[model samples]
Target: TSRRWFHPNITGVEAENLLLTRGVDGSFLARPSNPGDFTLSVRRNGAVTHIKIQNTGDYYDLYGGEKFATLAELVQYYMEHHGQLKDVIELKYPLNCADPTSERWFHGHLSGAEKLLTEKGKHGSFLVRESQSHPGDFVLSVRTGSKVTHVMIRCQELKYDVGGGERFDSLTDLVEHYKKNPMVETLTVLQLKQPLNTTRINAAEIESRVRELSKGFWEEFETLQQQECKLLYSRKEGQRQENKNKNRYKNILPFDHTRVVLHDSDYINANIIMPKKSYIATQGCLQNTVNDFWRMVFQENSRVIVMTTKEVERGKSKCVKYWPDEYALKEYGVMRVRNVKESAAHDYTLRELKLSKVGQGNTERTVWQYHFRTWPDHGVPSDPGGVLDFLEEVHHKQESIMDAGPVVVHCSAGIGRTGTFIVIDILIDIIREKGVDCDIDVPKTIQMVRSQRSGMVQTEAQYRFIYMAVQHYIETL
Candidate 1:
């Protein structure tokens, strides 16, 4: 019986880590300096294959404009159709086994051999070992060079060519070829030994080792923070002007940051593997940048803003009271905002605002702004659960958002409390996906978040808090 095949919703980081675990060379996948712009390319012999998503817009146009949802799917398709080079790009991902249902497929059945051949015949690679009778001879064969190019297979004599021909592209092809001549040998595709990369096959072990590194990840994380990168909004690049908040640099939302990868993207932001661009880490809005800030929210299609900082902190304007009073509408340059509803909580104040674009049609959007008052500036929450609870509330509200923009998450400078909260949110999802053992790399994850936006987990305390929260999250998971 065919079993259910399950494909989980994966995050960018999860997908990336999984691909690496499968022995895909680092070069096979490309993550451009720009956050969220990811691509996977497989090169073989001489031609390069660009994996693409089918564009629904060009669904009818089919050949006119290429559109595919994912590279993984495209590769599976190529294996069935334009599969002239499988061994060249040796798919390390168990395309068949990866599908949970693959576990039930009969291994001894002859039809399975034919099925495999029909699916993977064009791939140019193989597995050939010694048979009972030919213990000293070549157990398998090799297909050196094809069409225009060829390669030498040194199997038996080490220097001499083994059984050579077009090569057994698929395991079934090899089996069928041997059957044709009754080659005295036991030649099957897999279970004949593992990958060419031993370290890759032990991916689970690697996950454990990487997860353990999070315990003391900050030292290395801090070192990497100082190193230079090429993001459009790196620390050295997006220096905010006008001296709006107390610390100008801290308060600036690094444009080259990650979040709502708009065409209006922030620092202090980490990514959630599922429902991409679900959160944004940014500095609290300033008096001067209030207009630009609204423009960002509107353009980015955000329906919620979680303000970790209050309007005033330490007797200073940490963030301006950008919204109007209850049931009031006011203009902030080109945007008009009205506080449609307000409810105070023990630790936070939740307000719903009806925001409208000032110009023609006055396109209106609703925004839920949650002000968590208990969290202090330059401080960690007394109880981490308190913060997690509020964030969970905001996340639940986001399920109803239409355009799927990020929940604008912010605090005074956008990197400290901002990073802390974002990191907690991200880690929760990671722990949930990987389970308690934690298939995550904290240092690399932090570096990834910071590289796109400077100063995430701005303080050592904040960095440490991430580990704490992740620990708590993993335990709960």
Candidate 2:
């Protein structure tokens, strides 16, 4: 009897051991368990030859199946039939595969007689060049299984070589280096062109206009400065009395629609007037004059408010002395004082009613009072707690006067702190209760106030400070 050679089962532990042995040798071969069944074989260099079993029971009968000549060819075929191979190979020795001068003959096939002499390496087989078309140089050799396969000339370029003389390990690194070189070139171009003037005419025109406007505005501003200086000096002696009795000359006059007071255009221009409401006159008493002047043109109800900051003394009597029983005084409320000094006005108006002395304190019964003190001299009576206290007082007074009538507010030169206080109060009320929408336009509410009280909160500093104060009040609440 003849002995039959049976193939071992390539599965589990035995199959793993076979894979390990094949891996170390960089070669692999496998056959199906039943010789009469299908049999598959793989060479060390990845070439594949398959034998399919037929009903004949003879191994030689299975030789008709396809054979792959190279490992890459076999891998491509296997990937198409079985599963995709994701391993990527980057060629480094030959810089450009498209160059014809390169001796890397990835193109040709060898004769069957010469295939037996090649020695296989880990990945492929070494190819020995028998005859060289070019002399004195050897082609790089690759071997697969029993065949010497492809040949290529070694690269001569060494300029890109690092210290260890190794080529770029990956193709991505080479591409990235080329990409960065262009970016550096682009940046250099931008740097050289940055300061070139593209809009020379526009730049020159802007500079010229700025210089011209500044010259004209400053010339007029200097004359205004001189006038302000003269006024300040002439009024200096009466400053103390002005502060004491500032509100004495301050009066709110009712507006009679029938009356028209045609004061001098110069006075009208200097004094800010609200058309339907009051006009404030500072540092001058115009109550009797404005009343008599307007009475001639219109009916009695056409009223105007006069506010003055003047030096006066505290007196023993509380009678309205400055313009008593004038037509305008009777028609609208009148306020006056005689002996009070200017420096004491803010304190006098602020102090409690019965508690305030004529020369020393204030009568506080009236919800509205004008108080003055020398600013930047007596230091403006700054109390750290005073702002919140005053806000609370105003809030209480507002509640009490919901029905008490329009509470008139004033200070000496009503455009200063007095305007600021009233504007702030009105804005606070609008923001808290009226739901006034001002998102699109910031100055809308102030514009309304200007229409009611002309040039209300006139100075930029006063406007800005009042806005800040309003914001602070809202935040605290």
Candidate 3:
């Protein structure tokens, strides 16, 4: 990744012009100075500064500071830890000379892409690769029914175009646009539907994915946020007159197909997300709906519940206090819930609760509630490390309890933080099950979850945080 930032044969003057013209504050690039030595040119406060990198045959460092084996390591260190460099020139963005081939779909010059597409891909499955015949050009390979079709993509003036139509600034933009619009090839029309499993990124490259998204994931999320029309599933259950007051937000509702219908009643602002793994993402408990919340837990036989908000935040009632005092029991409609014990971790709390039916004889069960308090309302946490740790502990409890139904997760409105947490956990599970080389697609995962629930991962910041959390988890492995 750092090697992409190194532009050779470029003079300091040209580097300065590049950083000044194209770079934002904190953007930087590396270039060679003399033989076996390099210079780090950075943009700060509308000015470019050139710092000499002392590269010994054994190691690399910034003059007299900490050393690293690779220049990528040194650059990564400064980018992660703020104020590590002099004059507080943090490396926020690296001005790449070319696009990093870390994207899973970009199979450069590989003839093997066809075999993978034909054997693995269905109709409309597609991939983008460097054009063999023409240097600096690309080919859009699509699996069209029984045969594969190749479309030449001209790369001129740093923009990509499929022969003649609209040109896109990046390959991702072109692919995303073409995914919706069909391509005409004289006698036949080709549609770009699935991205040929290119979305699954290797576990080792998760950090690169995070870095890439940090720069432009907003555009990806923005594109996803505007897809209101794709929501073909009916949300009639949430819109019903009886369940209107049960929701925390008027517009944030669950799709009827996946929404959990209570046996005692009929409605709850909750959806069964990722049905195979099974997670019930729901809104925070309302004052009138506390009984319904408990009843759903009992009916679903869920052993773990994740609460992501505090009872009160910034003078607002984010969620009602649905549980009873420690060691005390409370009767919630049909079942009895007693707070057995409570313990605190760095970013969250663990509460042990005992539940039993009123008429059922001596049948009792234990439930664990992981209350995460570090997250702020409508905003993400300052770091993903804490959230990762919280989820690790939460999963441990879920895995320990036998037949522990679908874990219930909730936030204030439930869509934002709830969706973020669910996506992170699911991605982590995929990485764990399929080793480091497994491919994971962040946007596709969220879109799948959103189809089950009305709005799974809500804000762009939350979407970005999902990548960060996954990156942090992969690093720990």
Candidate 4:
């Protein structure tokens, strides 16, 4: 029943568009070629090609290749064997059919959920799989005591419940509630434990989940907000009396384990977030702590700086100027920064700064600064297209530099827009590396970064924008 790559209703032309737009080389899908026949559409060398599949009354097979009992078997054979098709074409990634929801636990049409939980799940392990018997409804498979129980969850009028219980707004809410309370089925009781973690999804299917979540963005964000306290780590360093004035917001402190430690001073309102790559998420520079900021940059050997806020926003000083003017030089603590060049891009300003240690060895290096100006203080952009373009350019510049350290990113409190930018960039890297068929968990990603720093992807709107930005990137590919 795991024929996710098989599209039952799409035409050959529609399959071509899907493969050409969202697939890389070796990406493919199967769709209806004629009334009852099927075709395999594959992308290669920037173009799409097709091969006919004949469905005899008994078996299915490529025009002249080996026949199989089901379409899944034929596709699976070709996926494992490279040149079953001509030497020119191979299927590497399957562009799966989109699912109704994007929730991590919603496994679509996974026929073996009961067996999987029985074999891999602990006493309290649970997962929600799509119900094949009742379309648009779901099945909660739980491993209680020694046996796995299947509970039919009813979905009526955009709410979810099991036969007769409390109707919840979303599947996530229903699961969270059941995690604490037991669900009874007639005469038996079932206790839901930790969810069985299933992470990957077809990258092309993200668009559907984005549309589904867009309808109820607030609920998803509120759930994320409520779970924030559960992942909190220690922040003893930022709360110390000596470090009180160094923080931009007294309440917003970086975790002690991940906070960047300088060579001598050893304190700054910054945390090293290494979700996929290394990045220093920090607050804007204060007048007194400007020297410490430059010292952290020099010691860390960072090559790129991303400032997501303006020097002044809505008549409030969010971040003071941390660099010298164009073609000018200034000294901060043991480091001296010289503005070597300045240029403007579509929505951000790029600067080339020369950093040098004043005494001792007198070594110098080049650092690039990308200052985004269009984003407001406490809001998202009207559109995510511009932000995607901005990140693409930033990504390219970072790749060109040799042995660059963590790219420093900051906003006012370093948790709102800062977290948003970091999360988007991480997801972008994942899609690029794993191909469009890979799965991504947005909330889990936010939690990973917040575990290192605190309060990343801060607002409800910002959470929605991360989905929007990633959806746009995949669609345009």
Candidate 5:
């Protein structure tokens, strides 16, 4: 309906045909007043990006499972998020994929979907929390087959989906609806994943798993390296002078790898730090990477820094002092980082890093630096209380800049201790959000973190540290 939305590469009609040709039968073209905003059934053949509609509250619900008042708000969220809706959609199924047959199931699984809603007030419960929806409320949409033209699915009923819009909460509901009618061969969503809250990780079981990965952590780290030798350059400047062996999993390439990203670094690696780009892990800066390090910080709009290691730790040179020690005039490339304020406690040191760009647009941004003290190299604190206290301070600092870029974390090599802190902090959040006894798999959690950067839980001892820290922290709660 909106010609303005039509692009030269693909018109609205062309997009509709792409959907139909690719087995999207339940939904077709021009069902709503505006083709630009096709009400129900999402259209995705990988040709014109996505369906032309945003009707269902389910559309907004899949933003990591949190609901928004409108679809515009939901999409605005993804533009800022790393795993964006359009990017993930293209990643899963390119419209003219070299071989379309290979990705026939592209629509079978592609994040979450939406349904045209009549009134904002009608979908109140579904628009807020993950709690159950109002009784009889449905995510209205179109369906395939002559017998089933249009269907209304219950937003909360993931349990069943009868023909006449009786109950249907998920995309599978559409797949099963074809029991009698099979026109719509697939389901679609305008998201990267189904939802963040779908899976439940068990806390009790996670402790044991964390310890197990730690026992032979080095061996496990080696196996991952074999798969991608180029990702971690053996010759990054940091590795050139320092103990290359110590910086094994701490390296990053100057260019690109598998990460869907922004900013760049040989030591920096991305992961599911949170539901979004919540954390960026890297090794301690060296004399050369200092400029690139600040480049990343400014580019990513980083607002917080979690330095787990002191500049000089033990007998070795652990990390380079990346910021100005005394004043705000220490200039790094185009940006000038000024020390606004500095305070230290037994747990850590907190500094206000005021970064100002001096170009066409001289902008000033504030970044918090939380430097944790006491925890030594390759070891955990004797008392879990100290590490927990540090994590609490980090939690508070992070809350103030919730909408800002990731909390950059680094240590000597950035893997062992860095990984340990991230894991513990993530658990603190998962437990707080999902409840203390909620299902959590600590082993899988570390596996995910390490997938982005190898050897996250450096040694068996550090591994045991994460387990002990979580249990102690959770028990107190």
Candidate 6:
């Protein structure tokens, strides 16, 4: 009679009910309530099946079959009397134990039980121990074909023997530990090295050498200036002169006036004249000569008064219209005058006339000063006397103007008459104003002026005679 069977109590009864009602084929077994009354039996067709009796509840008590009474008693008996199950489970799959479900799946008997095995076969195996020795511990033996490839031990608690092994709680900690270890060792090696050599030199000594070289170069430049001055003098004497029968005209002259007369000639032509306090003598062909001569003298400034002996002919009008070129006028800032009285004829026309009264007041005053005059046909003759007269007028006029300016006097080429006039002016100044008795360097002065101007005193006679006249003027002064 099946030992007077009784229904057992089960937890999760509703879940069991649902599983049964859904027609899912499964069995639900529960613990028995009767104490010391547990029995088991199994029947098989071909293979023999075995069953066991165990204690159901309360402390241990003997069943009629002589087994332990309560279920807990039977379990204790199996633990002490029979071979004990290993307390640990070795896992084939790497487990993420932080997740409760994964931990349960790894160690729970319902989940990984079949994967734990002893003898190797087609299924991978591990030693699942259910024993107190190394409690909750197991060893995994991984095999390929019949050979073991790896082994692992599983334990409830493990302590590693890390001698100098880095303790890393996080990934960043591990990386930082490695990075500092190698870098510090490399820095230590570098600190012990030394440079190959060290030396010094005197920088100031080298700088002094550079400065000496520069000074030497500058000293040579002074010699260059002297050479240039000498070359200029040589060129002037050789190139700028005119010669005629036994006469040499040295048109160019320095500022000094007591120069030697190097030739024989009468009536020197003085182009630039300086007079103290004299009036122009309106006599001889002097007036006509003055008009014609001034036309050349003032050729640069181009406006002058002419005192004609007769009424100006129509044919001579163009000749009168001719004027000095601009180049000559700008070279020396002065003009030549002609008939001052005629130019001052009309009161309306008087403004155009640059003529002042000569010696009219306490101050010296000019009778007339021309702008620029035209050159006439048959060119102007070099006239020293006329030029002197013109200079006298200029000097007197300058007193009123309050200018002791240089007078520019010219006849034809600005050489003959011009040179004589300038020579006389200088000599007079030396004698009357400077009161110096030194002789002028006539040849050198002429050469100097000629270097600046070509044909400054056109003919040899004009140039030579002017020097002679200059000598006479100095003697008189």
Q: Write the per-residue lDDT of candidate 6 for residues 95-195, one digit (tens) a residue.
A: 11111111101222222222332221332222222223345433222323343322222332342111235444422232224334421222221111111
> Which sections of candidate 5 miss by over 4 Å?
1-201, 204-277, 360-362
Worst 10 residues of 2 by lDDT: 189-198
Q: Give the TM-score of candidate 3.
A: 0.65
What lDDT does each candidate get?
0.48, 0.30, 0.77, 0.78, 0.50, 0.28
In the predicted model 4, the residue pairs found to clash are 201-439
**Over the stretch 246-364, how does candidate 3's per-residue lDDT look in tens digits?**
87765456778888987765888888986236799888888999999988999899999999888998787889988999999898888888999999887888999998888885768
Better of 3 and 5 by lDDT: 3
lDDT of model 5 at residue 262?
Answer: 38
Can you give the lDDT of residue 91 in candidate 2? Answer: 15
Clashes of 2: 37
User: Each prediction's TM-score against the native?
Assistant: 0.49, 0.28, 0.65, 0.65, 0.49, 0.25
Superposition error at 78 for model 1 (Å): 54
Global local distance difference test of model 4: 0.78
Residue 7 error for model 5, in Å? 59
lDDT at 287 for candidate 6? 22
- The candidate that wins on lDDT is 4
For all candidates, what are the clash counts?
16, 37, 4, 1, 17, 41
Over 169-248, each residue of candidate 2 has an lDDT whose tens digit, in order, gives 32223222333432122122111111111111221133343345345322222212112211111112222443323322
